[PDB]
């Protein structure tokens, strides 16, 4: 339902959306060739199939085509200084595709906006709505137009005879949180019986060791998950099920 | 939209100790008998915090408006639900998007949304005689409400509510902190009964809540409930009404503690790191105890105040065009 | 101002193959959305699929997808419609819509391709014209018509005077009978005076069988 | 998926009466709403193209308003030629939108007596084999009437075919044939053939009757 609405909403009004609770296949979104730019910060494509987190975030937007390059870290550039800025941390993925099927009218279309001007950065994660008007001079505006004064958003106007350079791509933003609480969404992966005491190698929501379990009588706290004393190596699990 | 009903009457506010409140799990893993050193946002272990009066049938009514600067630390023992919620925001109208969470009898409700706000608004409670009861018919508090984007009711988590006729006898602590776009809501709740008003024992806190919230906060209030009166149209009383409560708040910097562990696993002991020289010392050493002698810690150095920035004055443009 | 014109009517059977088209003029064929809606007598409509000629991007709904085909051609600027294998479970109405994919979709549409799908023979009608006696009524106005009951299948068009006369014509919808016929009649109303010196001639056509037949009325006799 | 419905069902006002139907969804469609007008068939007409945004071409007295989950479209002043069927499509996934389950709309009028008229087999069809005797109704209101056929006073029942048409837009009136199909045997054994027509804009029951040798 997000990778196949019908409309996209402006890239300086962003909405976001939680996904939590179910079991994901991304092999879909790699077999397919029909994206053009399709980018992993932080995470192997493949290794995706293999990895449970707490939730994804998904944004989406359309811009132009020149400007495709400019979603990622580092990166400075108008839309990404005044509209949408990335931590220098970011892990997730990137998807982009051409649009120029359903975002083209033979007039011209006006229903996407974008700011120009602003005082200031923003954070990395960050939205601005406000219609205040930008003052470049001295003079008070007082509401109204005037010199050194100007409305800060302003239209693209996509056309469908305009060349690759003008054309419109929908892009989609993909993050996860991890290592902060217990998984929630998954991948398919059938479960196993367990073994009491024999040294095996397990695979517990993601997380690789080998060694012997046990059962131990260790007053664990019920809203913990698991614990590391030192070393940086894990010794007391929880089993999902 | 709204009335105006204020006093022209104010009070200085009034200070007091904060002894050893304030701290926190900073993580959900789990150690068993190991010291550890950790970073973030805590409340300093001696401070002033100021503490206000919020009862007025001699009398003090105060419902002032406090900053947030990242992150807050609340605090209350309330018998009769005088504070219910909380409001943030920057402007307080339609425009930006707040925060309302109501507890009851029956389930907790919190609720986000854009509420329009009344200059000093206040929830209201009535009593029905023929049901013996006390309940909310005055709704009036907000006037119009519009985009809502989370709602999330309930059972209640830490409220008893059972005993008719209970004089101050546990305590509620509150931590709100945002970053990222993110709020983080830590509780508390302890069972007391002392003489004096803050005890000397020592408890953590556990995380709570976490939202994602895309806006900034830079100014919070709370509320408050009123009893209606039944007054005679002679009477010419003074118009508020409300029961006995007071409040604790503070605020948090960020500082670098070192706590000790238990056996079982929970926080009995913590020490901070710039209080006085000799915590600075038993920072750099590792155990809670030192040997007499001479002991080495970081060293000194002078800050700057001013800056100043020189360059040739050439008036000439580029002939880069 | 943009026409589109469909395919004529169209009668087959169980196991054979069929194909309908749809043409636009009137404007820039490569630059919107051809899409393709059907309508099963007596109840609501379903889309079934839209086509872009440009990139040759086409999309199906999820109830009829592997059943039907799409395609569409730039050089005439026509789009088509195609099948596999048909049922006894295949006779409708389609229209064929020109959308866009931003502000409005279903701008225009055609004019109705009618599908028949059975197993039996088409028949061709027999006409029997009735005439008012040689008095009129007291209405002033008597009235004057035909009948028709023997063809399959539906429908059939029946037009007076070349159609010139149009007020006061009425027609009553085909009722299926016991042995898998259809009845309808035509009726109409005429000044009195019109008899004595005006004839009117109705004609009759039908596609499935390809006849037009053309009949005159004359006053009824007293032929006691 | 997503499924829609509509309220009332159908429903009937006057000429000057206000109209208002809803459409109602099982989630949240976020204004992606259409509606479409169908005449007795015919192709169906766009009328408007969002939750409030009005199509060229169409007259003002249409409005429509809603959001969320609920949605009304308002008809300000009837008019006599506005009898047609109306839909509601929502439009949120690429292809997957569906319509919803229609409404009729109906005006009443004044009670209007019926005009009878009755037509015997010509001699064509006798030639042929058979006879059919054909009852007809005229400008009629309202739709509901009843259709009897004696033949020498005997009354004949299973043996006679129905056909109504739609309600006019000029006089807003019904009309009614009744066929009477029989062989030339049968035809020719009897004399008389009556049809009788009962309706409530009658005083009494009508009958018209003839002869066939007085024919
Ligand atoms: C829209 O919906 C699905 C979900 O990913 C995708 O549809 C695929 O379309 C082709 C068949 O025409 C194949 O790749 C798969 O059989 C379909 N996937 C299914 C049925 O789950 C499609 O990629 C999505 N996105 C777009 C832009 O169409």
């Given at each position: 339902e997000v990778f196949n609405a019908t409309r996209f909403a402006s890239v300086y009004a962003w909405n976001r959306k939680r996904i939590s609770n179910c079991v994901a296949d991304y092999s879909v979104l790699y077999n397919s060739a029909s994206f053009s730019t399709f980018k992993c910060y932080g995470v192997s494509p493949t290794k995706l199939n293999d990895l449970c987190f707490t939730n994804v975030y998904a944004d989406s937007f359309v811009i132009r085509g020149?400007?495709?390059?400019?979603?990622?870290?580092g990166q400075t550039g108008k839309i990404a200084d005044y509209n949408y800025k990335l931590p220098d941390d970011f892990t997730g993925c990137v998807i982009a595709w051409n649009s120029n099927n359903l975002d083209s009218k033979v007039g011209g279309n006006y229903n996407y906006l974008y700011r120009l001007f602003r005082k200031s950065n923003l954070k990395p994660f960050e939205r601005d709505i406000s219609t205040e008007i930008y003052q470049a001079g001295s003079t008070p505006c007082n509401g109204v137009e005037g010199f050194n004064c100007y409305f800060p958003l302003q239209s693209y106007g996509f056309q469908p005879t305009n060349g690759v350079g003008y054309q419109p791509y929908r892009v989609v933003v993909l993050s996860f949180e991890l290592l902060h609480a217990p998984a929630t969404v998954c991948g398919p992966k059938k479960s196993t019986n367990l073994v009491k005491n024999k040294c095996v190698n397990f695979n517990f929501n993601g997380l690789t060791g080998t060694g012997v379990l046990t059962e131990s009588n260790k007053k664990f706290l019920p809203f913990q998950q698991f614990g590391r004393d030192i070393a940086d190596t894990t010794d007391a699990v929880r089993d999902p099920q | 939209q709204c009335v105006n009903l204020t006093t022209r009457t104010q009070l200085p506010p009034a200070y007091t100790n904060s002894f050893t409140r304030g701290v926190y799990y900073p993580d959900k893993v789990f150690r068993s008998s190991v010291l550890h050193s950790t970073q973030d946002l805590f409340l300093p272990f001696f401070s002033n915090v100021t503490w206000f009066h919020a009862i007025h049938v001699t009398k003090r009514f105060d419902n002032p408006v406090l900053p947030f600067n990242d992150g807050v630390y609340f605090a209350s023992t309330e018998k009769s639900n005088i504070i219910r919620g909380w409001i943030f925001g920057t402007t307080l109208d339609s425009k930006t998007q707040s925060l309302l969470i109501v507890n009851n009898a029956t389930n907790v409700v919190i609720k986000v949304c854009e509420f329009q706000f009344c200059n000093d608004p206040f929830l209201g409670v009535y009593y029905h005689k023929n049901n013996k009861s006390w309940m909310e018919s005055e709704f009036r508090v907000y006037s119009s409400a519009n985009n809502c984007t989370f709602e999330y009711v309930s059972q209640p988590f830490?409220?008893?509510?059972?005993?008719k006729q209970g004089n101050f006898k546990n305590l509620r602590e509150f931590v709100f902190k945002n970053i990222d776009g993110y709020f983080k809501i830590y509780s508390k709740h302890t069972p007391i009964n002392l003489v004096r008003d803050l005890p000397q024992g020592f408890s953590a806190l556990e995380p709570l809540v976490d939202l994602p919230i895309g806006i900034n906060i830079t100014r919070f209030q709370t509320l408050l409930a009123l009893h209606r009166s039944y007054l005679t149209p002679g009477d010419s009383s003074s118009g508020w009404t409300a029961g006995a409560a007071a409040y604790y708040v503070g605020y948090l910097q960020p500082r670098t503690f070192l706590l000790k562990y238990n056996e079982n696993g929970t926080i009995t002991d913590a020490v901070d790191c710039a209080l006085d020289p000799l915590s600075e010392t038993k920072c750099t050493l590792k155990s809670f105890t030192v040997e007499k002698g001479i002991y080495q810690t970081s060293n000194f150095r002078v800050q700057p105040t001013e800056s100043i920035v020189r360059f040739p004055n050439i008036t000439n443009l580029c002939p880069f065009g | 101002e943009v026409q589109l014109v469909q395919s004529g009517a169209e009668v087959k059977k169980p196991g054979e193959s069929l194909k309908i088209s749809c043409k636009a003029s009137g404007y820039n064929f490569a630059y919107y959305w051809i899409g393709w809606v059907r309508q099963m007598p007596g109840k609501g409509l379903e889309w079934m699929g839209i086509i872009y000629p440009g990139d040759s991007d086409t999309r199906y709904s999820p109830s009829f997808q592997g059943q039907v085909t799409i395609s569409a051609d730039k050089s005439i600027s026509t789009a088509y419609l195609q099948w596999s294998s048909l049922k006894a479970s295949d006779t409708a109405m389609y229209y064929c819509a020109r959308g866009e994919m931003?502000?409005?979709?279903?701008?225009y549409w055609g004019q109705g391709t009618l599908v028949t799908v059975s197993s039996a023979s088409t028949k061709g009608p027999s006409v029997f014209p009735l005439a008012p006696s040689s008095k009129s009524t007291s209405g002033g106005t008597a009235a004057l018509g035909c009948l028709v009951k023997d063809y399959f299948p539906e429908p059939v068009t029946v037009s007076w005077n070349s159609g010139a006369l149009t007020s006061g014509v009425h027609t009553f919808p085909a009722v299926l009978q016991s042995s898998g016929l259809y009845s309808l009649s035509s009726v109409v109303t005429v000044p009195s005076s019109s008899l004595g010196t005006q004839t009117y001639i109705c004609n009759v056509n039908h596609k499935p069988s390809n006849t037009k037949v053309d009949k005159r009325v004359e006053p009824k006799s007293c032929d006691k | 998926d997503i499924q829609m419905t509509q309220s009332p069902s159908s429903l009937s006002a006057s000429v000057g009466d206000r109209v208002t139907i809803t459409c109602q969804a099982s989630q949240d469609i976020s204004n992606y709403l259409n509606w479409y007008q169908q005449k007795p068939g015919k192709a169906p007409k766009l009328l408007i193209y969002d939750a409030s945004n009005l199509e060229t071409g169409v007259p003002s007295r249409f409005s429509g308003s809603g959001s969320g989950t609920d949605f009304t479209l308002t008809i300000s002043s009837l008019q006599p030629e506005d009898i047609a069927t109306y839909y509601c499509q929502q439009y949120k996934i690429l292809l997957t939108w569906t319509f919803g389950q229609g409404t009729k709309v109906e005006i009443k009028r004044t009670v209007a007596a019926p005009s009878v008229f009755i037509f015997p087999p010509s001699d064509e069809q006798l030639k042929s084999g058979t006879a059919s005797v054909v009852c007809l109704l005229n400008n009629?209101?309202?739709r509901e009437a009843k259709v009897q056929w004696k033949v020498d006073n005997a009354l004949q029942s299973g043996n006679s075919q129905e056909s109504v048409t739609e309600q006019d837009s000029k006089d807003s009136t019904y009309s009614l044939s009744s066929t009477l199909t029989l062989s030339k045997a049968d035809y020719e054994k009897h004399k008389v053939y009556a049809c009788e027509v009962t309706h409530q804009g009658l005083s009494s029951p009508v009958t018209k009757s003839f002869n066939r040798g007085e024919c």
């Amino acid at each position: 339902e997000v990778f196949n609405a019908t409309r996209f909403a402006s890239v300086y009004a962003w909405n976001r959306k939680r996904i939590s609770n179910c079991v994901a296949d991304y092999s879909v979104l790699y077999n397919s060739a029909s994206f053009s730019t399709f980018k992993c910060y932080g995470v192997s494509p493949t290794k995706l199939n293999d990895l449970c987190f707490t939730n994804v975030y998904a944004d989406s937007f359309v811009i132009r085509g020149d400007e495709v390059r400019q979603i990622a870290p580092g990166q400075t550039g108008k839309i990404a200084d005044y509209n949408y800025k990335l931590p220098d941390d970011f892990t997730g993925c990137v998807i982009a595709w051409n649009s120029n099927n359903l975002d083209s009218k033979v007039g011209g279309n006006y229903n996407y906006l974008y700011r120009l001007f602003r005082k200031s950065n923003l954070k990395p994660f960050e939205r601005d709505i406000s219609t205040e008007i930008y003052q470049a001079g001295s003079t008070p505006c007082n509401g109204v137009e005037g010199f050194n004064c100007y409305f800060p958003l302003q239209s693209y106007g996509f056309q469908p005879t305009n060349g690759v350079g003008y054309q419109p791509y929908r892009v989609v933003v993909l993050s996860f949180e991890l290592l902060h609480a217990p998984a929630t969404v998954c991948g398919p992966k059938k479960s196993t019986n367990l073994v009491k005491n024999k040294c095996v190698n397990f695979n517990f929501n993601g997380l690789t060791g080998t060694g012997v379990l046990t059962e131990s009588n260790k007053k664990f706290l019920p809203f913990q998950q698991f614990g590391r004393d030192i070393a940086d190596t894990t010794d007391a699990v929880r089993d999902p099920q | 939209q709204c009335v105006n009903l204020t006093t022209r009457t104010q009070l200085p506010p009034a200070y007091t100790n904060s002894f050893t409140r304030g701290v926190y799990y900073p993580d959900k893993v789990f150690r068993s008998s190991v010291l550890h050193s950790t970073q973030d946002l805590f409340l300093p272990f001696f401070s002033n915090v100021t503490w206000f009066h919020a009862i007025h049938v001699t009398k003090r009514f105060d419902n002032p408006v406090l900053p947030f600067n990242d992150g807050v630390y609340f605090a209350s023992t309330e018998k009769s639900n005088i504070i219910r919620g909380w409001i943030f925001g920057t402007t307080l109208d339609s425009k930006t998007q707040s925060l309302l969470i109501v507890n009851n009898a029956t389930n907790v409700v919190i609720k986000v949304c854009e509420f329009q706000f009344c200059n000093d608004p206040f929830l209201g409670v009535y009593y029905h005689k023929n049901n013996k009861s006390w309940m909310e018919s005055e709704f009036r508090v907000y006037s119009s409400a519009n985009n809502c984007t989370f709602e999330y009711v309930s059972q209640p988590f830490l409220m008893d509510l059972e005993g008719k006729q209970g004089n101050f006898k546990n305590l509620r602590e509150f931590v709100f902190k945002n970053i990222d776009g993110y709020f983080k809501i830590y509780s508390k709740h302890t069972p007391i009964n002392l003489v004096r008003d803050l005890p000397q024992g020592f408890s953590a806190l556990e995380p709570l809540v976490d939202l994602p919230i895309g806006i900034n906060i830079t100014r919070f209030q709370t509320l408050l409930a009123l009893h209606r009166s039944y007054l005679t149209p002679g009477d010419s009383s003074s118009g508020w009404t409300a029961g006995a409560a007071a409040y604790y708040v503070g605020y948090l910097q960020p500082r670098t503690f070192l706590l000790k562990y238990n056996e079982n696993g929970t926080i009995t002991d913590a020490v901070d790191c710039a209080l006085d020289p000799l915590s600075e010392t038993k920072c750099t050493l590792k155990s809670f105890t030192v040997e007499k002698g001479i002991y080495q810690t970081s060293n000194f150095r002078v800050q700057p105040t001013e800056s100043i920035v020189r360059f040739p004055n050439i008036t000439n443009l580029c002939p880069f065009g | 101002e943009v026409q589109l014109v469909q395919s004529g009517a169209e009668v087959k059977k169980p196991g054979e193959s069929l194909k309908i088209s749809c043409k636009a003029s009137g404007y820039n064929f490569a630059y919107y959305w051809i899409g393709w809606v059907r309508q099963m007598p007596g109840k609501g409509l379903e889309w079934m699929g839209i086509i872009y000629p440009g990139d040759s991007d086409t999309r199906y709904s999820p109830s009829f997808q592997g059943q039907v085909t799409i395609s569409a051609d730039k050089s005439i600027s026509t789009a088509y419609l195609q099948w596999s294998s048909l049922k006894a479970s295949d006779t409708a109405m389609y229209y064929c819509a020109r959308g866009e994919m931003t502000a409005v979709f279903g701008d225009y549409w055609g004019q109705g391709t009618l599908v028949t799908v059975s197993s039996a023979s088409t028949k061709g009608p027999s006409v029997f014209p009735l005439a008012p006696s040689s008095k009129s009524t007291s209405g002033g106005t008597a009235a004057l018509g035909c009948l028709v009951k023997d063809y399959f299948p539906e429908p059939v068009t029946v037009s007076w005077n070349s159609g010139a006369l149009t007020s006061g014509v009425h027609t009553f919808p085909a009722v299926l009978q016991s042995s898998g016929l259809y009845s309808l009649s035509s009726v109409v109303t005429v000044p009195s005076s019109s008899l004595g010196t005006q004839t009117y001639i109705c004609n009759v056509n039908h596609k499935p069988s390809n006849t037009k037949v053309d009949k005159r009325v004359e006053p009824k006799s007293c032929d006691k | 998926d997503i499924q829609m419905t509509q309220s009332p069902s159908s429903l009937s006002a006057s000429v000057g009466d206000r109209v208002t139907i809803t459409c109602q969804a099982s989630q949240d469609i976020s204004n992606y709403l259409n509606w479409y007008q169908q005449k007795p068939g015919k192709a169906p007409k766009l009328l408007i193209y969002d939750a409030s945004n009005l199509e060229t071409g169409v007259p003002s007295r249409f409005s429509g308003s809603g959001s969320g989950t609920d949605f009304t479209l308002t008809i300000s002043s009837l008019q006599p030629e506005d009898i047609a069927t109306y839909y509601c499509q929502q439009y949120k996934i690429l292809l997957t939108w569906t319509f919803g389950q229609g409404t009729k709309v109906e005006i009443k009028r004044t009670v209007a007596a019926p005009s009878v008229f009755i037509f015997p087999p010509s001699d064509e069809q006798l030639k042929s084999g058979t006879a059919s005797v054909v009852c007809l109704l005229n400008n009629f209101y309202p739709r509901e009437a009843k259709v009897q056929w004696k033949v020498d006073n005997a009354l004949q029942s299973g043996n006679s075919q129905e056909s109504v048409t739609e309600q006019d837009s000029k006089d807003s009136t019904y009309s009614l044939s009744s066929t009477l199909t029989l062989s030339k045997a049968d035809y020719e054994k009897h004399k008389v053939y009556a049809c009788e027509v009962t309706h409530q804009g009658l005083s009494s029951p009508v009958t018209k009757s003839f002869n066939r040798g007085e024919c």
